[PDB]
Amino acid sequence: VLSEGEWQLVLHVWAKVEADVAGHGQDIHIRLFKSHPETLEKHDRFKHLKTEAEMKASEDLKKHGVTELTALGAILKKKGHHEAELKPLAQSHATKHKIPIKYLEFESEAIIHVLHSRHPGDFGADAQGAMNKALELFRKDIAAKYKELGYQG
Ligand code: HEM
Numbered sequence: 615v616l617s618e619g620e621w622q623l624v625l626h627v628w629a630k631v632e633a634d635v636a637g638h639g640q641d642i643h644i645r646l647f648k649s650h651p652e653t654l655e656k657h658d659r660f661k662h663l664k665t666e667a668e669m670k671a672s673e674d675l676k677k678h679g680v681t682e683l684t685a686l687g688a689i690l691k692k693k694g695h696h697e698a699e700l701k702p703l704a705q706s707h708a709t710k711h712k713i714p715i716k717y718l719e720f721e722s723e724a725i726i727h728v729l730h731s732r733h734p735g736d737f738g739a740d741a742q743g744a745m746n747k748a749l750e751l752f753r754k755d756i757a758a759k760y761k762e763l764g765y766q767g
């Protein structure tokens with residue numbers, strides 16, 4: 615679990631994300647999609663965006679990133695007591711979108727990369743460690759709900 619201070623480190627960098635959710639969302643997806651192209655295949659509505667220029671030009675990819683980061687931020691503000699928010703996400707990501715738990719680890723990597731590329735002076739090792747811990751808590755909880763809904767993460 616995370617200490618209150620660890621949560622505050624997480625929420626301080628998240629306050630920076632909220633200043634430009636769409637920009638962070640784009641950077642995270644472009645990183646994810648490039649580093650791990652199997653993630654772009656799972657985003658089948660966007661898999662026709664072959665190049666970074668096409669990715670950046672897509673208004674609907676940008677909206678999808680706001681949708682996902684808005685939901686993540688609500689989860690983080692709940693500081694571990696995110697059962698409410700997790701339940702629909704688990705449902706859809708397990709049974710509709712079919713996202714393996716390992717892809718959430720890919721996403722956590724991309725998030726941490728973007729946050730330190732955009733906010734050095736707010737993301738040193740302690741903050742990075744708190745954010746890592748928070749996303750790992752998230753993933754472990756999603757993993758559990760996957761198993762309860764059936765069929766492995
Ligand atoms: C940080 C954890 C993430 C959060 C908070 C998040 C949140 C969401 C939300 C709120 C939606 C719209 C509602 C829904 O369908 O449930 C969505 C859709 C989706 N997410 Fe995620 N997501 C997460 C991670 C991922 C990852 C890691 C993948 C794939 C590598 C992914 C793939 C998808 C896809 C393919 C859709 C549907 C987009 C479409 O409408 O075309 N999600 N996600």
Ligand SMILES: [Cu+2]
Binds near residue numbers: 643657678679682
């Ligand atoms: Cu996405």
